[PDB]
Amino acid sequence: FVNQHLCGSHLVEALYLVCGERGFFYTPKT
Amino acid sequence: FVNQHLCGSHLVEALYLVCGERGFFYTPKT
Amino acid sequence: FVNQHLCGSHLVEALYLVCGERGFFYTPKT
Amino acid sequence: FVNQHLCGSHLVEALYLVCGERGFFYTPKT
Amino acid sequence: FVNQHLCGSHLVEALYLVCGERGFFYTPKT
Amino acid sequence: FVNQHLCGSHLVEALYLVCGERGFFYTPKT
Amino acid sequence: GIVEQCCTSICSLYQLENYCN
Amino acid sequence: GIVEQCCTSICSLYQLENYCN
Amino acid sequence: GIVEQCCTSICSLYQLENYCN
Amino acid sequence: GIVEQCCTSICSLYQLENYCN
Amino acid sequence: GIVEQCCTSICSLYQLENYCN
Amino acid sequence: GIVEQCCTSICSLYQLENYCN
Numbered sequence: 163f164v165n166q167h168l169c170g171s172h173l174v175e176a177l178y179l180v181c182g183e184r185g186f187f188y189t190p191k192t
Numbered sequence: 193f194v195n196q197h198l199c200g201s202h203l204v205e206a207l208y209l210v211c212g213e214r215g216f217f218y219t220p221k222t
Numbered sequence: 223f224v225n226q227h228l229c230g231s232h233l234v235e236a237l238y239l240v241c242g243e244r245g246f247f248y249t250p251k252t
Numbered sequence: 253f254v255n256q257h258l259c260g261s262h263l264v265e266a267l268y269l270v271c272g273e274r275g276f277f278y279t280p281k282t
Numbered sequence: 283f284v285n286q287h288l289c290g291s292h293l294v295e296a297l298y299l300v301c302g303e304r305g306f307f308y309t310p311k312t
Numbered sequence: 313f314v315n316q317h318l319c320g321s322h323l324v325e326a327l328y329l330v331c332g333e334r335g336f337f338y339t340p341k342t
Numbered sequence: 343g344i345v346e347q348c349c350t351s352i353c354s355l356y357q358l359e360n361y362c363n
Numbered sequence: 364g365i366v367e368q369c370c371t372s373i374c375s376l377y378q379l380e381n382y383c384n
Numbered sequence: 385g386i387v388e389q390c391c392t393s394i395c396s397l398y399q400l401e402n403y404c405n
Numbered sequence: 406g407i408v409e410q411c412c413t414s415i416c417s418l419y420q421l422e423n424y425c426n
Numbered sequence: 427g428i429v430e431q432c433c434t435s436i437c438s439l440y441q442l443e444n445y446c447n
Numbered sequence: 448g449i450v451e452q453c454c455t456s457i458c459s460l461y462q463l464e465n466y467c468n
């Protein structure tokens with residue numbers, strides 16, 4: 163595939179795409 | 193605020209808005 | 223909740239979330 | 253342009269594109 | 283209508299809106 | 313990666329993520 | 343109204359443009 | 364759970380806020 | 385207006401309700 | 406085609422990758 | 427191309443139709 | 448974290464899977 167800059171809501175839309183039913187955590191403080 | 197009807201990626205967008213820098217966890221059934 | 227920068231289409235998606243059936247106005251000239 | 257089938261937040265995205273700096277009003281029934 | 287800056291995923295959402303069933307190509311290298 | 317259920321503009325968002333700078337073509341039936 | 347029309351049936355960009363300020 | 368509730372029925376922002384870290 | 389309050393600056397979800405009908 | 410498959414059934418990222426330039 | 431016309435610069439909805447099939 | 452890897456820097460879809468549950 164590719165590497166791009168994924169920021170903000172775009173980052174969590176990509177995590178949704180990639181993870182799906184597994185679920186995911188978005189933790190920007192780290 | 194009003195009640196929401198959110199499916200798919202729209203839930204993840206809403207969580208992103210609600211949580212901000214706190215981030216969140218997305219955990220579907222199964 | 224939190225405070226973030228909401229711009230462009232992201233701003234009107236947040237107004238949609240927050241206002242829902244009430245409806246809203248987006249008027250950037252002011 | 254082609255005709256559109258738009259629900260939820262997708263309508264608000266389309267209005268945003270169509271109206272630009274003019275902005276718009278979003279007014280659902282009820 | 284208007285002219286705005288349309289970039290990234292926002293650009294392809296606008297092409298989707300505008301083209302619809304015709305389909306479209308997104309070719310950033312040119 | 314997980315399998316996807318994507319309609320409308322959500323397909324175009326997924327293609328955008330998958331293809332990056334390569335871009336893509338969107339070609340619906342009919 | 344437009345909100346319902348675009349979702350239960352179809353609508354055009356020209357009809358949407360009516361809701362601009 | 365929340366994911367299913369917001370989609371099959373409705374949910375509030377206050378319920379969503381429970382899933383923040 | 386909304387742009388200055390929410391994009392240029394920073395706003396809460398409650399301030400966003402100022403632009404509801 | 407892919408547009409219809411991903412919406413009426415399911416599709417993979419690997420199938421989508423076929424539509425890149 | 428599209429990026430230069432629409433992102434770097436500024437384009438109308440009609441110019442965007444230049445990239446339809 | 449994710450922001451530094453994917454927004455500030457640049458990440459692949461595989462690196463994004465590092466944040467799946």
Ligand SMILES: [Cl-]
Pocket residue numbers: none
């Ligand atoms: Cl952006």
Ligand SMILES: [Cl-]
Pocket residue numbers: none
């Ligand atoms: Cl949808």
Ligand SMILES: [Zn+2]
Pocket residue numbers: 202262322
């Ligand atoms: Zn949708």
Ligand SMILES: [Zn+2]
Pocket residue numbers: 172232292
């Ligand atoms: Zn954006």
